[PDB]
Write an enzyme that holds these catalytic residues in place. Sequence first.
Site, PDB file in Angstrom:
ATOM      1  N   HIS A  34      -1.182  -6.984  12.274  1.00 21.92           N
ATOM      2  CA  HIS A  34      -1.657  -5.585  12.319  1.00 21.92           C
ATOM      3  C   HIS A  34      -0.503  -4.575  12.229  1.00 21.92           C
ATOM      4  O   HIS A  34      -0.681  -3.465  11.705  1.00 21.92           O
ATOM      5  CB  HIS A  34      -2.418  -5.403  13.636  1.00 21.92           C
ATOM      6  CG  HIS A  34      -3.511  -6.410  13.850  1.00 21.92           C
ATOM      7  ND1 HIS A  34      -4.624  -6.500  13.036  1.00 21.92           N
ATOM      8  CD2 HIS A  34      -3.658  -7.365  14.794  1.00 21.92           C
ATOM      9  CE1 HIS A  34      -5.415  -7.463  13.484  1.00 21.92           C
ATOM     10  NE2 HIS A  34      -4.849  -8.010  14.545  1.00 21.92           N
ATOM     11  N   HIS A  42       6.018  -0.287  18.258  1.00 20.74           N
ATOM     12  CA  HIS A  42       5.549  -0.594  16.927  1.00 20.74           C
ATOM     13  C   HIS A  42       5.220   0.714  16.226  1.00 20.74           C
ATOM     14  O   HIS A  42       5.296   1.789  16.835  1.00 20.74           O
ATOM     15  CB  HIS A  42       4.282  -1.457  16.975  1.00 20.74           C
ATOM     16  CG  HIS A  42       3.173  -0.783  17.711  1.00 20.74           C
ATOM     17  ND1 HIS A  42       3.010  -0.856  19.061  1.00 20.74           N
ATOM     18  CD2 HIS A  42       2.197   0.056  17.268  1.00 20.74           C
ATOM     19  CE1 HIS A  42       2.002  -0.064  19.420  1.00 20.74           C
ATOM     20  NE2 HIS A  42       1.507   0.503  18.354  1.00 20.74           N
ATOM     21  N   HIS A  65       2.578   2.722  13.081  1.00 21.41           N
ATOM     22  CA  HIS A  65       1.446   2.790  12.178  1.00 21.41           C
ATOM     23  C   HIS A  65       1.870   3.608  10.975  1.00 21.41           C
ATOM     24  O   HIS A  65       2.596   4.596  11.155  1.00 21.41           O
ATOM     25  CB  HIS A  65       0.215   3.434  12.852  1.00 21.41           C
ATOM     26  CG  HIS A  65      -0.153   2.789  14.151  1.00 21.41           C
ATOM     27  ND1 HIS A  65      -1.149   1.853  14.249  1.00 21.41           N
ATOM     28  CD2 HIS A  65       0.358   2.933  15.398  1.00 21.41           C
ATOM     29  CE1 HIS A  65      -1.244   1.454  15.521  1.00 21.41           C
ATOM     30  NE2 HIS A  65      -0.327   2.097  16.225  1.00 21.41           N
ATOM     31  N   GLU A  85      -1.573   8.311  13.415  1.00 21.65           N
ATOM     32  CA  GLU A  85      -2.848   8.177  14.142  1.00 21.65           C
ATOM     33  C   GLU A  85      -3.237   9.523  14.731  1.00 21.65           C
ATOM     34  O   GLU A  85      -4.275  10.091  14.393  1.00 21.65           O
ATOM     35  CB  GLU A  85      -2.690   7.066  15.196  1.00 21.65           C
ATOM     36  CG  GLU A  85      -2.437   5.703  14.549  1.00 21.65           C
ATOM     37  CD  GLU A  85      -2.928   4.569  15.377  1.00 21.65           C
ATOM     38  OE1 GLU A  85      -2.503   4.454  16.557  1.00 21.65           O
ATOM     39  OE2 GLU A  85      -3.735   3.771  14.824  1.00 21.65           O
ATOM     40  N   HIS A  93       4.976   4.153  18.367  1.00 21.99           N
ATOM     41  CA  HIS A  93       4.418   4.007  19.703  1.00 21.99           C
ATOM     42  C   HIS A  93       5.335   3.162  20.538  1.00 21.99           C
ATOM     43  O   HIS A  93       5.521   1.973  20.288  1.00 21.99           O
ATOM     44  CB  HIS A  93       3.039   3.372  19.626  1.00 21.99           C
ATOM     45  CG  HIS A  93       2.020   4.273  19.049  1.00 21.99           C
ATOM     46  ND1 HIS A  93       0.809   3.834  18.530  1.00 21.99           N
ATOM     47  CD2 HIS A  93       2.043   5.610  18.887  1.00 21.99           C
ATOM     48  CE1 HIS A  93       0.151   4.858  18.060  1.00 21.99           C
ATOM     49  NE2 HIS A  93       0.855   5.949  18.289  1.00 21.99           N
ATOM     50  N   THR A 134      -5.204   2.232  20.643  1.00 19.75           N
ATOM     51  CA  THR A 134      -5.753   2.597  19.325  1.00 19.75           C
ATOM     52  C   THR A 134      -6.125   1.378  18.485  1.00 19.75           C
ATOM     53  O   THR A 134      -6.576   1.558  17.355  1.00 19.75           O
ATOM     54  CB  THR A 134      -4.800   3.492  18.527  1.00 19.75           C
ATOM     55  OG1 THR A 134      -3.666   2.725  18.156  1.00 19.75           O
ATOM     56  CG2 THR A 134      -4.409   4.752  19.272  1.00 19.75           C
ATOM     57  N   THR A 135      -5.916   0.169  19.029  1.00 18.18           N
ATOM     58  CA  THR A 135      -6.421  -1.064  18.417  1.00 18.18           C
ATOM     59  C   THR A 135      -7.267  -1.782  19.437  1.00 18.18           C
ATOM     60  O   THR A 135      -7.079  -1.628  20.650  1.00 18.18           O
ATOM     61  CB  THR A 135      -5.264  -1.972  17.971  1.00 18.18           C
ATOM     62  OG1 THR A 135      -4.305  -2.148  19.042  1.00 18.18           O
ATOM     63  CG2 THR A 135      -4.537  -1.394  16.801  1.00 18.18           C
TER      64      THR A 135
END
EC number: 4.2.1.1
Length: 257
Positions: free
Chosen positions: A61, A91, A93, A103, A116, A195-196
Amino acid sequence: HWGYGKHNGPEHWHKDFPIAKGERQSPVDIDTHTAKYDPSLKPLSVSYDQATSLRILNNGHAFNVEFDDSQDKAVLKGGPLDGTYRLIQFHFHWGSLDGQGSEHTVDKKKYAAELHLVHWNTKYGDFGKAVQQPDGLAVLGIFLKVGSAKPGLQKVVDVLDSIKTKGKSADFTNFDPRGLLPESLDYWTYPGSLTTPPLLECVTWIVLKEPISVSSEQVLKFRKLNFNGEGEPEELMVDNWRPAQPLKNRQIKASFK
Ligand SMILES: NS(=O)(=O)c1ccccc1
Ligand SMILES: O=C(O)CCCC(=O)O
Ligand SMILES: [Zn+2]
């Protein structure tokens, strides 16, 4: 399993994770004019001098840079927080193009990516217990825009070739996350969620106002990663962001005037 496709992306997650339609979901759009300045908010205390990175992992992911969180070595305090939160991993996004990837949004603006830095509240003893609590995590979010290179990011960029596919990891010691921070620690804060999946409503979000600049070449290397495992049909790891969710009954507070 969940992911970021037509068939398994964010609009499907609620079927396996009904909290997806909950009252404190993340990310959100930050409406800068309605965020209220809160003079009671403290400066954020980011103490990363003794951070010990261990490893970098492609989890299918994103990629996670993992830290030794077995002692008070990299901690986040102050700001809106009570107590001490220990860094476990960071990590990103990011998008397929520079015009999307973050995000959180700011007045509907999407940044190219979002970092994040994930921390858990030491009062719960470890991460797995912390995510079961409404004040269990503090995630420091930092926007990325494309322009000048971020020199402190390059060590991360250069190891990505070794973790192209899901399940690959690589030793990643001595990485200093201070090199990923902007000059200012001015922030917005609100209560939200992972958020996941599992989308748990356990996060105090702290989103920095000042983005970092990364180069086009740096973000292009993010986009060479794969969601798939080795020897599977190649699906580039891009657009691994959840869109903004309803704010519902929440207030976003600003640390700055
Ligand atoms: N992406 S996020 O909200 O920082 C997150 C952090 C830890 C676990 C799952 C999600
Ligand atoms: O499990 C599902 O299919 C999502 C809905 C469950 C619920 O809303 O309680
Ligand atoms: Zn994240």
